[PDB]
Design an enzyme around this catalytic site. Structure first.
Site, PDB file in Angstrom:
ATOM      1  N   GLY A   1      12.781  -1.565  11.214  1.00  9.28           N
ATOM      2  CA  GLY A   1      11.350  -1.562  10.972  1.00  9.28           C
ATOM      3  C   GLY A   1      10.872  -2.551   9.920  1.00  9.28           C
ATOM      4  N   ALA A   2      11.655  -2.738   8.859  1.00 11.87           N
ATOM      5  CA  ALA A   2      11.305  -3.666   7.777  1.00 11.87           C
ATOM      6  C   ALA A   2      10.999  -5.061   8.329  1.00 11.87           C
ATOM      7  CB  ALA A   2      12.448  -3.746   6.762  1.00 11.87           C
TER       8      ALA A   2
ATOM      9  N   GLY B   1     -12.007   8.750 -18.764  1.00 13.73           N
ATOM     10  CA  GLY B   1     -12.803   9.611 -17.913  1.00 13.73           C
ATOM     11  C   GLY B   1     -13.057   8.959 -16.565  1.00 13.73           C
ATOM     12  N   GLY B   2     -14.173   9.310 -15.933  1.00 11.07           N
ATOM     13  CA  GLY B   2     -14.492   8.740 -14.636  1.00 11.07           C
ATOM     14  C   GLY B   2     -14.701   7.234 -14.641  1.00 11.07           C
TER      15      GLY B   2
END
Lengths: 353, 168, 176, 176
Positions: free
Chosen positions: A242-243, A5-6
């Site tokens: 970019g890498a 759950g949460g």
């Protein structure tokens, strides 16, 4: 044990999560609801067992065989970190012997002649760390990149390195987020970061674009540009497009950037570059359209696929002998440990999510 | 070879030798004749033995004005890096009079700015060893921009980190 | 989508108004595998981090963790309002009764079902509202739907001078 | 004179406008013997130290160090303008070619002089202007003289919110 759950969101916000194989499980919604709603049949283990969250979801940083090992893992994690962000990580200072040893020498031959042949990046990392000890985090998640802790002269350091052996060491969504969160963690707790580069580029794929690699991959550059702890980067081999910017480049704020003679720092591959640069030239003379292309390619790679153009600009502070990497990091961290840098005042940044 | 790892290591060894001997053999003779030392001998005197770590050793100028691009010596006229003096951190730059007469150029200037940013960033003194015939005229205003960037750093670092000028 | 937006508003000093009618999280193996645990946590982080004025209005559903996530007072929200139609509870009626009244339903297996159908009805009439939350002060007021604009206007007037700050740090370590 | 004025303006938050037309530094044994090196340095220090808006306009001459000293961008000036008549260069054409073409002039000694005269002419027509500086962005714009007021008025409107800080220190160590 279970975390359902949460409740799951609490560990999610914490810095590290360690699970025990086949004892622990984490999930927001259990099997029962998933079935009576999607018609899917999924068991606890597959849904959110230790192995699942350590290699698929990317929510856990370690999977242990038992609780004793899991406890030992956190004690280790705690040994590389300060008690709070007010101080530097705990240290047991010990001067290092800088004489080149036989192990150091091994680095001169660890990189194969063929650019496509892989080598184990773990070896490079171990050769610079005290006692060749590398405490790895998230080993099973995004194996194409390595993260973890070690010590240089008794002082904890964090590591981020492309792994040629896994998916050719490419950068992709998972590796970007894994490393991004690890970098910010080290920075927040004053841990210097050492990064080793051998990245061909980003993993091509329609899925990467649709899954949002644009905003997700950006988290890694943000991490590096935000960091104020010492940053030392070593390019062992590939660093394209970019890498290259992304992998702890000096352009992002990296303090010291070193490259091996084997480094290839360039916008792109030779083939792709000439097909654009020499389109018209190659187009001329259909007769022999191709050996001239082959010639331009050979010429392009012999001139630009090295680290020297970057060295001429100061993009890398020095091109070094692989065997001298341990030497450069030791001496660099000695001077860089007093680094004092601050960002513009703000409540906080707005890193892509 | 050159397409081999070992070959790349040998190629680097060669570049080191060239970079470490940027000025001609006779230029060095002239320098020693005058009763001066070379840029590197000066660093060797100041820094603790073996503590020197050179930065931008393979830096080269990017000018093509007046055929200056015929000669692009590694280091571009100035030796920079860090080390220690009596065990304490120090950043240093040493102008090489044997290269272009030590005339300050763009890349030459940025190399100095780098050593200065490093010193302000880590909080250590800066020792500058001066020996230059002036601006490298072929580069025009680029030479002026570099000086201005150094002056700015001198000012910002004033009273922050010790700055010592050795004019030889 | 929401976490980034809330973080953008906070960074630039923009108050944040949130309207709640959430049944829970989308069920699915794909959500777990794609990291819902670390990615949904980003929204609670954004709210717990925020220092700009925060006003939340629960129009209808607000179950389980979702209720915590959607700007609940527990995360630091300043003004929390609920309409009469709000249903603030840990879980749906059927799920809850099946657990709490497991044995009761088990017993009298003969006609086991209108027994639970009754428990479910009783459970929803007793808990599926905002009144238990209001008793603890989890919501500052249960209001008429038509008085929403009024509350927000008057709340922002007071809350606009809000001055709060987190513990000193270089930055946080929000899950990525 | 100017160094003190600039520092006074900066200390009391007054923006500084500087107009440049300097041929260089006054030559003379006296200037040297009287410490022009440490005294002329005060002006560069004042400019490099200032955090108030700084706008500079080069109307004409801007040679060598004097160019750097007169509120140049390299020192931190925010907006640097130049008139078409500006001359931004390391040194005068005559002295420059006398060094750049010492061998070219030597060769063909016979008629050595209209050769250096040609070179001087070519040098000043290509370099003694503000366009090389503009290519590098050393000046943000080359403008028509009549548009100076317009540029200063609009520059100041935006620059007046300038916020910049120097490294922490008790004070600087300006040459005295």
């Amino acid at each position: 044990g279970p975390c359902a759950g949460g409740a799951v969101y609490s560990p999610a916000i914490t810095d590290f999560t360690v699970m025990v194989d086949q004892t622990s499980h984490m999930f927001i919604t259990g099997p029962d609801v998933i079935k009576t709603v999607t018609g899917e049949d999924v068991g606890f283990e597959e849904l959110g067992g230790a192995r699942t969250h350590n290699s698929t979801s990317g929510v856990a940083h370690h999977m242990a065989g038992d609780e004793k090992d899991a406890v030992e893992y956190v004690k280790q994690l705690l040994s590389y970190l300060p008690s709070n962000n007010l101080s530097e990580p705990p240290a047991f200072p010990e001067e290092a012997d800088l004489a080149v040893t036989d192990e150091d020498a091994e680095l001169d031959t660890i990189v194969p002649d063929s650019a496509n042949q892989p080598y184990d990046m773990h070896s490079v990392i171990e050769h610079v760390l005290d006692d060749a000890e590398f405490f790895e985090t998230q080993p099973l998640f995004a194996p194409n990149i390595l993260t973890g802790f070690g010590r240089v002269e008794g002082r904890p350091v964090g590591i981020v390195a492309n792994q040629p052996m896994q998916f050719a060491g490419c950068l992709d969504i998972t590796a970007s987020e894994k490393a991004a969160r690890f970098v910010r963690t080290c920075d927040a707790f004053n841990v210097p970061v050492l990064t080793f580069v051998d990245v061909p580029g980003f993993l091509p794929g329609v899925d990467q674009e649709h899954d949002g690699i644009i905003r997700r991959g950006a988290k890694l550059i943000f991490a590096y540009a935000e960091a104020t702890v010492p940053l030392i980067t070593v390019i062992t081999r590939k660093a394209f497009g970019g890498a290259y910017d992304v992998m702890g480049s000096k352009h992002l704020g990296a303090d010291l950037n070193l490259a091996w003679p084997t480094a290839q720092i360039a916008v792109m591959g030779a083939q792709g570059a000439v097909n654009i640069l020499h389109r018209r030239t190659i187009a001329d003379a259909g007769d022999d359209a191709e050996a001239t292309r082959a010639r331009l390619i050979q010429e392009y790679e012999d001139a630009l696929l090295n680290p020297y153009t970057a060295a001429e600009r100061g993009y890398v502070d020095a091109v070094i002998m692989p065997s001298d990497t341990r030497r450069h990091i030791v001496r660099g961290l000695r001077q860089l440990r007093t680094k004092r840098e601050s960002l513009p005042p703000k409540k906080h940044g707005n890193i892509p999510l | 070879d050159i397409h081999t790892t070992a070959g790349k290591l040998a190629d680097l060894r060669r570049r080191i030798e060239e970079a470490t001997h940027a000025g001609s053999a006779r230029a060095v003779e002239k320098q020693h004749a005058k009763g001066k030392l070379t840029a590197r001998e000066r660093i060797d005197l100041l820094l603790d033995e073996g503590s020197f770590v050179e930065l931008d050793e393979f830096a080269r100028h990017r000018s093509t004005n007046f055929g200056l691009d015929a000669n692009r010596p590694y280091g571009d006229g100035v030796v920079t890096g860090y080390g220690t003096v009596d065990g304490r951190p120090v950043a240093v730059f040493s102008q090489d009079f044997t290269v272009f007469g030590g005339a300050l150029g763009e890349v030459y200037g940025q190399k100095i700015v780098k050593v200065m940013d490093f010193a302000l960033k880590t909080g250590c003194p800066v020792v500058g060893i001066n020996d230059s015939g002036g601006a490298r005229i072929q580069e025009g205003v680029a030479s002026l921009g570099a000086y201005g960037e150094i002056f700015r750093r001198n000012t910002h670092a004033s009273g922050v980190i010790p700055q010592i000028s050795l004019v030889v």
